[PDB]
Amino acid sequence: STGFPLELLTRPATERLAYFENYTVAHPRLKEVYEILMRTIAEPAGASFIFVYGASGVGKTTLRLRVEQKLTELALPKLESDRARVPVVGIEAIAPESRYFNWKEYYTRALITLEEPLIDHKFDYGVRGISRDNFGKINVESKVVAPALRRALENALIHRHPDVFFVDEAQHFGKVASGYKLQDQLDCLKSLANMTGILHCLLGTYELLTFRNLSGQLSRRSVDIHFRRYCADSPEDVQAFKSVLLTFQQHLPLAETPNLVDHWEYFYERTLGCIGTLKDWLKRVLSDALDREATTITLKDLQKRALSVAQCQKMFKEIQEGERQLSETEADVQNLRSALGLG
């Protein structure tokens, strides 16, 4: 069958909820972005940054998790022979309590997340304020200053040598007190990646575009991946969104499969084409239906757990500006050739 297993109807609601939660769909944009990210990670070729832009609902976190799992599986056969190697380390940036993005917490959290292997791996981190304990947890005291933590993290990264160092919610790097400090933060990240040779992937919303072009160097060593949403103007994206809706309604564990392609305009309006928004909206509707033990879904039920017009209106304003700034036209190439004198 092309949908949910029919046996799940006899099971109580918890297993149906879990099955719909763990189910993941494959759509052309996600597959394309995943292939591009894997190709970039496999051969960075002197590139230290991968800026993965995308709106809220594109699946950036799910893409990161899928890439992490696939990289771990790929590195497992070689990890059997070679040890002291982590395939991939992923940490999430923290929005600071103060007005400036603190780096000490970032360094210590990167050290914690990176260093959770089997205890057999001993590397005697630099600086005396960082050590192991009785429970295998990294001990970082307030004694150490930020450069000492940076040195310890650099040595640990060089020794472990992960394929890629994922940093989720990278927009939090923009919490600074000075405008030039915004470029200085990326310069610090570039130096960290240069002196350890570890590929850094930044996943964030469209406000990460403030890091897009600043200093030629940074630019040269940054790869831009756009996790674009499904637009309504292009019929192909509409067809893809309808196919996603059709497979979602096929995969809804209900006694009666509802009709969801009919109200595709509504869904879109309340999701803006983001697959994650559609997925969690359907999750809410299905949870309500299972709580009510209702054989099927109604538009009303969709209206109950939809997104407010004010919420979606703010979404499209940021998405419109994000895609406008990332719009590459053939006219732009003309100026580049004209400026280079190749016209």
- Rounded CA-CA distance 205/40 in Å is 20
Give residues 71-90 in contact with ligand ATP (rule: CB under 6 A).
none
- Rounded CA-CA distance 24/228 in Å is 18
Give residues 198-237 in contact with its own copies (rule: CB under 8 A).
205-207, 212-217, 219-224, 231-233
| Residue 280 among known ligand-binding residues | yes
Part of the chain binding its own copies (CB under 8 A), chosen from 64-72, 77-85, 178-186, 246-254: 178-186
CB of 127 to ligand ATP, least distance (A): 27
CB of 22 to ligand ATP, least distance (A): 8
- Rounded CA-CA distance 290/135 in Å is 42
Q: Which partner, Mg ion, its own copies, ligand ATP, none, binds residue 196 by CB below 5 to 8 Å per kind?
A: none
The reply to whether 54 sits near ligand ATP by the rule CB under 6 A is yes
| Residue 21 among known ligand-binding residues | yes
- Rounded CA-CA distance 37/20 in Å is 27
The reply to whether 324 sits near its own copies by the rule CB under 8 A is no
Instruction: Give the pair of three-digit tokens for residue 282.
Output: 């359907």
The reply to whether 61 sits near Mg ion by the rule CB under 5 A is yes
Binding mask 210-239 for ligand ATP (x = CB under 6 A): -------x--x-------------------
The reply to whether 336 sits near its own copies by the rule CB under 8 A is yes
Size of interface with its own copies, in residues (CB under 8 A): 112
- Binding residues, by number, are 21, 24-25, 27, 56-62, 168-169, 217, 220-221, 279-280, 283
Binding site for ligand ATP (CB under 6 A): 24-25, 27, 30, 46, 54-62, 168-169, 205, 217, 220, 275-276, 279-280
- Binding residues for ATP, by number, are 21, 24-25, 27, 56-62, 217, 220-221, 279-280, 283
